[PDB]
Amino acid sequence: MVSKGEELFTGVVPILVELDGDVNGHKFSVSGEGEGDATYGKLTLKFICTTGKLPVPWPTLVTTFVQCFARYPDHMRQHDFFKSAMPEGYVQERTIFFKDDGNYKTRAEVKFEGDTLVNRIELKGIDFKEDGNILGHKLEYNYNSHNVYIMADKQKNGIKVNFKIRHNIEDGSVQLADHYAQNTPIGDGPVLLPDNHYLSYQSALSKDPNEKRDHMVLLEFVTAAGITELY
Ligand SMILES: [Cl-]
Ligand SMILES: [Cl-]
């Protein structure tokens, strides 16, 4: 049978993203809107920096900006924590270590508000180099494909997640961003605690030719894998 959480994602769902950030005292806010289609693992989102110029590169916020939209194969449904926590939602905590630079700490609440799936984020960054790749805006406006590794954390009734992002630097090098995370339900009811598996991501960044505010357009596909003799 289709679970209550699964049922919420059977069609296209509107998304709202709201972020308040402070990186080395540079304060900023971002709003985002679009839609998720979990059946295809598809996100289409547009973000606006509502406070003026974004003081970090847009690519460094991609991972922060709704894993409930991952496409979980039928055979992996019992491993989809994110949908199982809905509609009450889950809290995602991350630390993102930029190699040879500062770190972000993020707290996101992911839940439904009516028919809208909301991703509400606080981000705090410290210890950045004011002339490094982040505060010096030396990252290319592009994005590589990565895997995100998920394991259960039974003690916390949630999951632990880790992955490495490689951001291309304008000189042909790479800026590593090591991510460590925890996701835990907001409500008190049962959730799906998964076996070890991963999510496979691909992301494309673009611009809206009619948009004059500092912004990012994101197309992202996300598919669960790693658990698989019928043939
Ligand atoms: Cl940028
Ligand atoms: Cl995560």
Side-chain angles (χ1 to χ4, degrees), residues 2-200:
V2 181
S3 67
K4 295 184 174 293
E6 286 170 349
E7 195 166 346
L8 294 168
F9 291 95
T10 53
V12 175
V13 175
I15 299 169
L16 178 62
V17 181
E18 310 283 356
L19 181 145
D20 282 343
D22 175 334
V23 174
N24 279 39
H26 302 273
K27 299 181 186 275
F28 61 100
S29 295
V30 174
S31 62
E33 57 161 324
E35 63 184 35
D37 187 338
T39 296
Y40 291 165
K42 183 177 189 169
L43 299 177
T44 49
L45 292 164
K46 175 179 174 187
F47 305 91
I48 298 296
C49 180
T50 59
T51 47
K53 178 172 172 56
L54 192 74
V56 299
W58 283 105
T60 70
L61 301 181
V62 167
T63 55
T64 299
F65 294 151
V66 296
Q67 291 154 299
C68 49
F69 295 106
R71 178 173 81 86
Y72 273 75
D74 177 82
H75 74 275
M76 288 179 67
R77 286 163 56 212
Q78 65 265 57
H79 302 293
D80 186 350
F81 166 86
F82 305 104
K83 293 185 190 57
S84 81
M86 297 292 163
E88 300 87 359
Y90 59 89
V91 175
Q92 181 195 79
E93 295 177 27
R94 301 217 178 116
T95 305
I96 307 172
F97 294 99
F98 290 89
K99 185 172 172 65
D100 300 307
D101 212 334
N103 63 88
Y104 297 163
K105 290 180 179 283
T106 66
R107 187 176 187 285
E109 288 191 10
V110 186
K111 67 176 85 169
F112 279 96
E113 295 294 341
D115 288 332
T116 298
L117 191 286
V118 177
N119 188 16
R120 183 179 72 68
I121 307 134
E122 290 177 10
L123 181 154
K124 185 70 166 289
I126 64 172
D127 296 328
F128 289 85
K129 292 174 177 176
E130 300 277 341
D131 54 347
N133 294 322
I134 291 83
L135 291 175
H137 296 267
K138 310 185 188 183
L139 301 184
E140 298 178 352
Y141 190 77
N142 55 31
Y143 219 90
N144 298 308
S145 297
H146 311 266
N147 295 332
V148 165
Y149 300 96
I150 298 172
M151 61 181 47
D153 187 343
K154 290 190 181 175
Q155 290 162 348
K156 293 284 291 170
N157 198 213
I159 57 171
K160 281 196 145 56
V161 186
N162 66 274
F163 55 104
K164 295 178 174 278
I165 298 297
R166 292 176 183 78
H167 296 293
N168 288 4
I169 305 169
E170 61 187 16
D171 66 0
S173 187
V174 288
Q175 171 69 62
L176 178 62
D178 279 299
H179 290 59
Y180 300 83
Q182 185 170 156
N183 297 273
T184 62
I186 291 174
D188 199 36
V191 293
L192 297 174
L193 304 176
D195 286 351
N196 291 6
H197 68 285
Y198 65 99
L199 306 175
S200 178

